[PDB]
Design a protein around this ligand. Sequence first.
Ligand SMILES: Nc1ncnc2c1ncn2[C@@H]1O[C@H](COP(=O)(O)OP(=O)(O)O)[C@@H](O)[C@H]1O
Lengths: 269, 88
Amino acid sequence: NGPEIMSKLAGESESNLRKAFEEAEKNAPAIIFIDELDAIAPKREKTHGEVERRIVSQLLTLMDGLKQRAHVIVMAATNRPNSIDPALRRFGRFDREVDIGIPDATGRLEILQIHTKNMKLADDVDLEQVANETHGHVGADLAALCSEAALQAIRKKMDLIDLEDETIDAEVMNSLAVTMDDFRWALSQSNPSALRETVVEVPQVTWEDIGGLEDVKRELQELVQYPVEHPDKFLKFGMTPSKGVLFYGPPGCGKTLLAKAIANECQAN
Amino acid sequence: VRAKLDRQRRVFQPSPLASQFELPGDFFNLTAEEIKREQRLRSEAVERLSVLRTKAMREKEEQRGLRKYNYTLLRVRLPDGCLLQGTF
Ligand SMILES: Nc1ncnc2c1ncn2[C@@H]1O[C@H](COP(=O)(O)OP(=O)(O)O)[C@@H](O)[C@H]1O
């Protein structure tokens, strides 16, 4: 991780970074995960000191050394893909990247279900309703919500049954169910850590959600689906598909639903 | 014609035995309901300070404490250790 390597003295940060790469080869196959890449190797054109530019050069040459270190893959994590020195993203080195972003309503439900695998939920618990309310929450926040709901169920019932000790009977644990009130309480205690960032999702809007505009709905299917569903006809007639459409008119007539509805049927973000 | 208030003049002598009591060892160990209630009252107190509301909503809550009593019981502590009580 960036800040730990950066907390070291000059010469120690470079030595520690080199050792990690040498150990990965010794233990190959291996994965080297560098967290806060923007902290360990910030843009050189955005720094001033020799040591900060030095550690960037040290990482850049170690990345190139991966052609000799067989079966070693280096992964890295940053908050913004453009906050790291552009040399790291040149052919070789970190030539692949994946945009993780923020989970959508479906992803949030999946996370809540994952962190409740062991939890006994009462019939009134509705995790889909929670996932729809938890806008701006990420997996770190949804995991906290599940653990907090579990704890509240434990304090309400089990602490009136069990001793103030480390060991609990299996039967008492299994007899506990977590109610919707315990999840809603946790929601009041938690606060989304990623509420301002843009969230990209596959919409749930379908064509039946839009009243009127029968011809516009069909027109979008022709503009968006036909160029890839029937490409041999577009080539046959030498027609260049349009890249987009602009909508105009009064507000509140369904412009957003139109774009989402075609994205929905196409299973597109 | 209205019935006259009975003063019910009485004098009492407090017994020192009423002040002799020992607590259970678990007296100071609060329960899950007492700790969750206290934390909810802290969150509600911060929320009430944050709420944007008109004077009419403020008075509706404040006015809840206005109607409980119209009589009083008075006691007088006398130099000789006796307590004098009556109704007013
Ligand atoms: N043609 C329509 N059919 C059904 N609902 C509509 C239609 N147009 C607008 N709405 C409703 O109005 C709301 C706002 O739509 P939107 O297109 O987001 O407006 P804006 O132009 O402000 O973006 C939507 O949530 C939708 O429920």
